[PDB]
Paper text:
[name] has since been recognized as a carotenoid-binding protein in the primate retina, where its biochemical function of binding lutein with specificity appears to be well suited to recruit this photoprotective molecule. The lutein-binding function of [name] resides within the C-terminal START domain comprising residues 216–444, hereafter referred to as StARD3LBD. StARD1 mobilizes cholesterol as the first committed step in steroid biogenesis, and homology between [name] and StARD1 suggested that [name] also binds cholesterol. The most remarkable structural feature characteristic of [name] and StARD1 is a large (∼1000 Å3) solvent-filled cavity.
A crystal structure of the lutein-binding domain of human [name] (StAR-related lipid-transfer protein 3; also known as [name]) has been refined to 1.74 Å resolution. The current and previous structures correspond closely to each other (r.m.s.d. of 0.25 Å), especially in terms of the helix-grip fold constructed around a solvent-filled cavity. The final structural model includes residues 231–444 of [name] (the coordinates for residues 216–230 were omitted because no electron density was observed), 224 water molecules, three molecules of ethylene glycol, one sulfate ion and one molecule of l-(+)-tartaric acid. A striking feature of StARD3LBD is the prominent tunnel-like cavity lined by hydrophobic and polar residues with sufficient volume to accommodate a molecule of cholesterol, as demonstrated by modeling. The tunnel-like cavity measures ∼20 Å long from end to end, curves slightly and accommodates 18 solvent molecules, one of which is an ethylene glycol in the current structure. Electron-density maps did not reveal any larger molecules located inside the cavity. The cavity communicates with bulk solvent through two openings, which we will call portal 1 and portal 2. Portal 1 is wider in diameter compared with portal 2 (4  × 8 Å for portal 1 versus 2 × 4 Å for portal 2; distances are measured between solvent-accessible surfaces). A segment of four residues (Gly336, Ala337, Ala338 and Gly339) was associated with weaker-than-average electron density along two alternative chain paths, suggesting that the Ω1 loop is capable of movement just outside portal 1. The new structure includes additional solvent molecules and alternate conformations for several residues, including Arg351, which is located within the cavity, and residues Gly336–Gly339, which are part of the omega loop found just outside the cavity entrance. Structural flexibility in these regions may be necessary for the binding of bulky ligands such as lutein. Modeling experiments indicate that the biologically relevant ligand must protrude from the cavity entrance because it is not possible to completely fit a 30 Å long molecule of lutein into a cavity that measures only 20 Å.
Author numbering: 231 to 444
Write the structure that this text describes.
Amino acid sequence: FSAQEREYIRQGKEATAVVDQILAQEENWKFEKNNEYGDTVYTIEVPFHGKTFILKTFLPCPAELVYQEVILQPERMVLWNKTVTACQILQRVEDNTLISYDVSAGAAGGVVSPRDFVNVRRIERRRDRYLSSGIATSHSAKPPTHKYVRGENGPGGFIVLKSASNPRVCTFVWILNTDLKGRLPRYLIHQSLAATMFEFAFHLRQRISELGAR
């Protein structure tokens, strides 16, 4: 591996370690907001990157289906997930480290403009869960441009937890630490992120339903 490939690999492992640490501290998550579907958003304060949002949703399908639809098919997720405007895999390192270009849709109400991102992700399959953990990185094919504000994710990820007791249900967790930059006050950004998390959950639920109807 080149030095650059090794740095991408390390970044994915580091992001995975933080995701694991957050999941191991669930008793310390602070409730923030929920909705009428029981989607629940929490926060946790993490060193350096600070405040991190966590979405937890119970879904009526096997964990493997969510792993396929969210974690293994990020480009296809653009089609059904309106919070995702675009996704392009720029580069793969080994089988489980990927560098992507990602564009997030403007806030449902237009106050927060779309951001684009460059991310490294590490995908791990475990006995009882699937993880896609990642963090901002740089890639020469996608410099910042005037088309978008270039946001920067801290450590976070998508996690699907298998149910030991009922194979027909699973738990979906989105850990989201991000800096959208710009000059809006933080509280407005935080409102927009929570809203985006609920919208994500809505599209994921609809996708699982559509797949279960066929």
